[PDB]
Short mmCIF file of C-alpha atoms in Angstrom, two decimals:
data_model
loop_
_atom_site.label_atom_id
_atom_site.label_comp_id
_atom_site.label_asym_id
_atom_site.label_seq_id
_atom_site.Cartn_x
_atom_site.Cartn_y
_atom_site.Cartn_z
CA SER A 1 38.20 32.88 94.60
CA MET A 2 39.70 32.29 91.28
CA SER A 3 43.38 33.02 90.52
CA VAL A 4 43.35 31.48 87.04
CA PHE A 5 40.77 30.45 84.45
CA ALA A 6 41.17 28.63 81.16
CA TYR A 7 38.41 29.72 78.87
CA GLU A 8 37.76 27.29 75.98
CA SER A 9 35.67 28.12 72.89
CA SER A 10 33.89 25.20 71.31
CA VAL A 11 32.84 27.40 68.36
CA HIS A 12 36.10 29.29 67.57
CA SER A 13 37.89 26.79 65.29
CA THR A 14 34.75 26.01 63.31
CA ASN A 15 34.34 29.72 62.98
CA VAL A 16 37.91 30.31 61.79
CA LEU A 17 37.63 27.63 59.14
CA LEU A 18 34.21 29.02 58.03
CA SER A 19 35.76 32.52 57.67
CA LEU A 20 38.74 31.10 55.73
CA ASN A 21 36.32 29.29 53.42
CA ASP A 22 34.40 32.54 52.95
CA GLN A 23 37.66 34.27 52.10
CA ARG A 24 38.43 31.51 49.62
CA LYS A 25 35.03 31.59 47.85
CA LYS A 26 35.05 35.42 47.69
CA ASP A 27 38.76 35.22 46.58
CA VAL A 28 39.79 37.56 49.40
CA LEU A 29 43.07 37.36 51.37
CA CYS A 30 44.19 34.26 49.43
CA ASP A 31 47.87 33.87 48.37
CA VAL A 32 48.12 30.76 46.15
CA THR A 33 46.49 29.57 42.88
CA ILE A 34 46.28 25.82 42.24
CA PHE A 35 45.96 24.70 38.62
CA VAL A 36 44.07 21.40 38.19
CA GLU A 37 43.19 20.28 34.62
CA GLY A 38 43.58 23.93 33.58
CA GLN A 39 41.15 25.11 36.29
CA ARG A 40 42.14 27.80 38.79
CA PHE A 41 41.50 27.25 42.50
CA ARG A 42 42.25 30.11 44.89
CA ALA A 43 43.52 29.25 48.37
CA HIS A 44 45.75 30.06 51.40
CA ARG A 45 49.19 28.47 51.26
CA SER A 46 49.14 28.01 55.09
CA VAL A 47 45.92 26.00 54.98
CA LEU A 48 47.03 23.78 52.09
CA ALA A 49 50.36 23.08 53.87
CA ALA A 50 48.42 22.29 57.08
CA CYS A 51 46.15 19.79 55.28
CA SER A 52 48.57 18.15 52.86
CA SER A 53 52.23 17.00 52.87
CA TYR A 54 52.47 17.48 49.09
CA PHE A 55 51.39 21.14 49.36
CA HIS A 56 53.61 21.57 52.42
CA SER A 57 56.73 20.59 50.41
CA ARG A 58 55.84 22.83 47.49
CA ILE A 59 54.99 25.86 49.69
CA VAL A 60 57.27 26.00 52.73
CA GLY A 61 60.38 27.45 51.10
CA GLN A 62 58.67 30.25 49.19
CA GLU A 63 52.21 35.12 45.29
CA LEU A 64 52.61 31.41 44.34
CA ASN A 65 51.37 29.19 41.45
CA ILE A 66 51.12 25.41 41.83
CA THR A 67 50.27 23.13 38.91
CA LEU A 68 48.96 19.73 39.89
CA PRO A 69 49.87 17.02 37.32
CA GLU A 70 47.45 15.00 35.14
CA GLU A 71 46.91 12.38 37.88
CA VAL A 72 45.08 15.06 39.83
CA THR A 73 41.58 15.58 38.37
CA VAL A 74 39.08 18.32 39.21
CA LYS A 75 36.50 15.61 40.08
CA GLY A 76 39.04 14.24 42.59
CA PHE A 77 40.47 17.52 43.85
CA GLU A 78 37.42 19.70 44.23
CA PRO A 79 35.85 17.68 47.12
CA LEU A 80 39.21 17.63 48.91
CA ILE A 81 39.78 21.38 48.80
CA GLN A 82 36.17 21.58 50.09
CA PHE A 83 37.07 19.17 52.87
CA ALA A 84 40.17 21.22 53.72
CA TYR A 85 38.00 24.26 54.14
CA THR A 86 34.76 22.71 55.48
CA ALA A 87 35.62 19.45 57.38
CA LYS A 88 33.01 17.69 55.21
CA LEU A 89 33.92 15.17 52.52
CA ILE A 90 31.07 14.26 50.18
CA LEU A 91 31.78 11.08 48.23
CA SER A 92 29.68 9.35 45.55
CA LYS A 93 29.99 6.24 43.33
CA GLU A 94 30.98 8.70 40.57
CA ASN A 95 33.80 10.53 42.43
CA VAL A 96 35.17 8.10 45.07
CA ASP A 97 38.09 6.52 43.13
CA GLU A 98 39.24 9.92 41.82
CA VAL A 99 39.03 11.38 45.34
CA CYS A 100 40.72 8.37 46.93
CA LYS A 101 43.63 8.56 44.46
CA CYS A 102 44.04 12.30 44.89
CA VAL A 103 44.18 11.85 48.72
CA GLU A 104 47.10 9.39 48.27
CA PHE A 105 48.79 11.77 45.83
CA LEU A 106 48.36 14.97 47.85
CA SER A 107 48.79 13.09 51.16
CA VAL A 108 45.78 14.84 52.68
CA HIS A 109 45.59 14.34 56.46
CA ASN A 110 42.70 13.28 58.75
CA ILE A 111 40.55 11.32 56.33
CA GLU A 112 39.32 7.91 57.49
CA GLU A 113 40.22 5.82 54.40
CA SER B 1 24.45 6.50 46.59
CA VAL B 2 26.52 8.76 48.82
CA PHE B 3 28.52 8.88 52.02
CA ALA B 4 29.10 12.27 53.56
CA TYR B 5 31.61 12.43 56.45
CA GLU B 6 31.91 15.37 58.76
CA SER B 7 34.99 15.68 60.96
CA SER B 8 34.35 17.46 64.28
CA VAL B 9 38.17 17.59 64.89
CA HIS B 10 39.29 18.79 61.47
CA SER B 11 39.02 22.50 62.13
CA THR B 12 40.96 21.93 65.39
CA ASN B 13 43.83 20.19 63.42
CA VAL B 14 44.12 23.03 60.90
CA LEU B 15 44.31 25.64 63.74
CA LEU B 16 46.99 23.45 65.45
CA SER B 17 49.04 23.45 62.22
CA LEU B 18 48.56 27.20 61.81
CA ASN B 19 49.68 27.68 65.42
CA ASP B 20 52.75 25.57 64.74
CA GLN B 21 53.60 27.61 61.59
CA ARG B 22 53.13 30.74 63.72
CA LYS B 23 55.53 29.56 66.48
CA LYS B 24 58.14 28.38 63.96
CA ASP B 25 57.64 31.64 61.95
CA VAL B 26 56.89 29.63 58.82
CA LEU B 27 54.28 30.64 56.18
CA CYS B 28 53.31 33.86 58.05
CA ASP B 29 52.60 37.15 56.21
CA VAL B 30 52.01 39.87 58.80
CA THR B 31 54.02 41.28 61.78
CA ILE B 32 52.17 42.87 64.67
CA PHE B 33 53.99 45.43 66.84
CA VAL B 34 52.77 45.62 70.43
CA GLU B 35 54.81 47.59 72.95
CA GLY B 36 57.77 47.33 70.58
CA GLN B 37 57.46 43.52 70.44
CA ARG B 38 57.19 41.71 67.21
CA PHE B 39 54.48 38.98 66.76
CA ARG B 40 54.34 37.00 63.51
CA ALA B 41 51.00 35.79 62.19
CA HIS B 42 48.73 35.02 59.21
CA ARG B 43 46.69 38.03 58.01
CA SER B 44 43.74 35.72 57.15
CA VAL B 45 43.56 34.31 60.65
CA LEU B 46 43.77 37.76 62.34
CA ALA B 47 41.02 39.03 60.01
CA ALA B 48 38.84 36.01 60.84
CA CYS B 49 39.33 36.52 64.59
CA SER B 50 39.20 40.36 64.89
CA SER B 51 37.16 43.17 63.29
CA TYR B 52 40.03 45.56 64.02
CA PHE B 53 42.57 43.42 62.15
CA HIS B 54 40.01 42.77 59.43
CA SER B 55 39.78 46.56 58.68
CA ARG B 56 43.59 46.95 58.75
CA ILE B 57 44.20 43.97 56.46
CA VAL B 58 41.42 43.61 53.85
CA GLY B 59 42.56 46.06 51.11
CA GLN B 60 46.32 45.90 51.83
CA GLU B 61 54.66 42.97 53.25
CA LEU B 62 52.23 43.90 56.03
CA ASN B 63 53.23 45.63 59.31
CA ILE B 64 50.55 46.52 61.89
CA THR B 65 51.46 48.62 64.90
CA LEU B 66 48.95 48.43 67.79
CA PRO B 67 48.67 51.63 69.84
CA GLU B 68 49.73 52.13 73.47
CA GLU B 69 46.32 50.92 74.74
CA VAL B 70 47.27 47.49 73.52
CA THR B 71 49.77 45.86 75.89
CA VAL B 72 51.72 42.63 75.49
CA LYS B 73 50.15 41.29 78.72
CA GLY B 74 46.72 41.89 77.14
CA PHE B 75 47.58 40.88 73.59
CA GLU B 76 49.66 37.73 74.00
CA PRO B 77 46.85 35.58 75.49
CA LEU B 78 44.50 36.71 72.68
CA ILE B 79 46.82 35.90 69.81
CA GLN B 80 47.21 32.57 71.57
CA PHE B 81 43.41 32.25 71.84
CA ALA B 82 43.08 33.05 68.15
CA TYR B 83 45.43 30.15 67.30
CA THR B 84 44.45 27.60 70.01
CA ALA B 85 40.83 28.28 71.13
CA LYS B 86 42.05 28.58 74.74
CA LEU B 87 42.20 31.83 76.67
CA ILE B 88 44.14 31.65 79.95
CA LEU B 89 43.16 34.45 82.28
CA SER B 90 44.64 35.49 85.66
CA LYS B 91 43.93 38.11 88.34
CA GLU B 92 47.09 39.80 86.92
CA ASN B 93 46.12 39.82 83.21
CA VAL B 94 42.31 39.93 83.12
CA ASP B 95 41.67 43.70 82.84
CA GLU B 96 44.40 44.08 80.21
CA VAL B 97 43.00 41.11 78.25
CA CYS B 98 39.45 42.34 78.60
CA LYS B 99 40.29 45.88 77.31
CA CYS B 100 42.29 44.44 74.45
CA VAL B 101 39.28 42.25 73.45
CA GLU B 102 37.12 45.40 73.28
CA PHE B 103 39.82 47.26 71.34
CA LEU B 104 40.58 44.52 68.81
CA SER B 105 36.96 43.36 68.69
CA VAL B 106 38.03 39.70 69.08
CA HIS B 107 35.19 37.29 68.26
CA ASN B 108 33.90 34.23 70.14
CA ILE B 109 34.83 35.03 73.75
CA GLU B 110 32.18 34.77 76.44
CA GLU B 111 32.73 38.08 78.30
CA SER B 112 31.09 36.68 81.51
CA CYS B 113 34.18 34.64 82.47
CA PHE B 114 36.24 37.79 83.03
CA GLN B 115 34.20 38.15 86.22
CA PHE B 116 35.55 34.87 87.76
CA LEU B 117 39.00 36.37 88.10
#
């Protein structure tokens, strides 16, 4: 019958993000280093720009080194880079104000505040 | 006490953004040559989506020339799949797309739908 068919993968995007996270954790095929409180986080500039307006501004014109200022803490940032790369944001009484602030600062998209 | 949120759309937003960078030619790092046509992409995404690109990328400005088995008619829908999750097949393109999936070893495509067209 069929002249056309639109095949749709329900697993593909989750799989891309998983592979990008695996790249990140193994430090393979990354292209940016973020410095937070003197701690080095490896990442992909495309993914950071996708997930955050702040990173988008600091990346789009441009290896790359980005220093986040003292308002950004590791306790606040670490869960957000994990969100960026996993779709899962784990918050606790301990980290929630630091995370909340760092979402305003980095302008991280798609987080129900 | 803890709240853990899991977005089922988040990975689909990131891929949308990456597709938009790709179309604008912003933040890309590899150029693919197919039939003398130039396709800009992200090496990380091609590696994630294809064993062939993974081998050509992992230890490596990056230029990747696909051989004459790879055609634009076969390739274009697959680079679009890789960045959208949607593969549009037609009686015209389906054999070319199918061969190019075998050649590139593109992940996450149910091969049984080639048979519909």
